């Protein structure tokens, strides 16, 4: 029926000792390079990408949709460049959810000029539940989330036909 887009982990605060300014030519906009407005790229700064345990408690009293990604680089050295750790883990939990992500190096065929890929994942934190993110590298952290309301009388239609 409705939802509301809201900055779950704000860029200019929530990531103090990680460099958030990650961008790509593959996500081009009007000439320049850009990225996903609802997601956010965390890279290693100064020394390393130190351990993180970013948490969000569902206050909203609505099903909050959370979207995060996991980056799988194509070259051994690129992994050690942007994330300063050769063996990385991404952990995503809720009261009734668990998943452990181990990104692995693969020189895959070039889709939109990228041998390396980002896998996209999603969950719905129920009102009252808490989402905790443990990582030491390769996490494409969320930026904006969606706190939906639902209500059938809606659907996905594939049409060419114009609106009036």
């Amino acid at each position: 029926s409705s939802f509301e887009r809201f900055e779950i982990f704000p860029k200019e605060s929530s990531w103090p000792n990680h460099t958030t300014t990650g961008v790509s030519a593959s996500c081009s906009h009007n000439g320049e390079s850009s990225f996903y407005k609802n997601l956010l790229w965390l890279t290693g700064k100064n020394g390393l990408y130190p351990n993180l345990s970013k948490s969000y408690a569902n206050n909203k009293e609505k099903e909050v949709l959370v979207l995060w990604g996991v980056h799988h680089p194509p070259n051994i050295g690129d992994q050690r460049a942007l994330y300063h750790t050769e063996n990385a883990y991404v952990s995503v939990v809720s009261s009734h959810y668990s998943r452990k992500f181990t990104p692995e190096i693969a020189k895959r065929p070039k889709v939109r000029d990228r041998e390396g890929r980002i896998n996209y994942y999603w969950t719905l934190l129920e009102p009252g539940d808490t989402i905790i993110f443990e990582a030491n590298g390769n996490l494409i952290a969320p930026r904006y989330a969606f706190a939906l309301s639902r209500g059938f009388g809606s659907g996905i239609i594939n049409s060419n036909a114009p609106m009036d």
Partner: antibody, heavy 127, light 110 residues
Framework: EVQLVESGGGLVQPGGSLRLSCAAS????????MHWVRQAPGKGLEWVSS???????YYPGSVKGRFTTSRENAKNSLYLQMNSLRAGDTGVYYC?????????????????????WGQGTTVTVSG | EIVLTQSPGTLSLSPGEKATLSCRAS???????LGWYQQKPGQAPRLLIY???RRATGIPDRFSGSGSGTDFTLTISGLEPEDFAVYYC??????????FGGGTKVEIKR
């Protein structure tokens, strides 16, 4: 191979306007941040402008006022608009390539440093 | 804010020798950003060292780079005739201020 061809002018009025053009060749432009480093008539290297792949311009207090950086990822060129030019704004202006985006495959190496340099183009203010 | 003070002001040695030029900034620099560039007389500058230790993708082995936090050093073991340049240490990275600035005018004087 890799090359940064710098072009522009030489003479302007004190408080005048000039534009510099930086042609590039031998590498993928759009995935590298760019900069302008000036060496005074005397000596001493100083950074004046820097633009990301995203188009975010950063300037030093010396020149924050009247200088502006632009990019034509299409024309493989980078530009510097030098407005209301001061006295000390004299010297040789250089074109440089530092860091590879973040999201740029893994082929072209990722490092914090400037590698490809240009020959320069000398700029002076009148009397 | 970040001040890259390059000591000595001027360095002068005979060929075949070893040179040690230092560069110490106000606060800690956390290595990964600091590099060294050779301003060869009458020409465009050139990169030699990056991320502190790192060598250039086409530069001699005579040149060594090392240091941490405040104090940093580029060490030329060979000191050939070509190796008589002015040199500068630069702080390139997440700041956005590049800082730069340097002296150490490595010349002959025998």
């Amino acid at each position: 191979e890799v090359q940064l061809v710098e072009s522009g002018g030489g003479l302007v009025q004190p408080g005048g306007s000039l534009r510099l053009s930086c042609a590039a060749s031998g590498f993928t432009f759009n995935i590298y941040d760019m900069h302008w480093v000036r060496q005074a008539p005397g000596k001493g290297l100083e950074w004046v402008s820097s633009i990301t792949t995203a188009g975010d311009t950063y300037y030093p207090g010396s020149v924050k006022g009247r200088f502006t950086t632009s990019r034509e990822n299409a024309k493989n060129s980078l530009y510097l608009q030098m407005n209301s030019l001061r006295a000390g704004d004299t010297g040789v202006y250089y074109c440089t390539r530092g860091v590879r985006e973040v999201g740029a495959t893994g082929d072209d190496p990722f490092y914090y440093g400037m590698y490809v340099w240009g020959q320069g183009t000398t700029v002076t203010v009148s009397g | 804010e970040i001040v890259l003070t390059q000591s000595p002001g001027t360095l002068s040695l005979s060929p075949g020798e070893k040179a040690t030029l230092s560069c110490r900034a106000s606060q800690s620099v956390s290595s990964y950003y600091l590099g060294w560039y050779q301003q060869k007389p009458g020409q465009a500058p050139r990169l030699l060292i990056y991320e502190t230790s790192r060598r250039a993708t086409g530069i001699p082995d005579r040149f060594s780079g090392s240091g941490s936090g405040t104090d940093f050093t580029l060490t030329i073991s060979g000191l050939e005739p070509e190796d008589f340049a002015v040199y500068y240490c630069q702080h390139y990275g997440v700041s956005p201020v590049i800082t730069f600035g340097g002296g150490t005018k490595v010349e002959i004087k025998r």
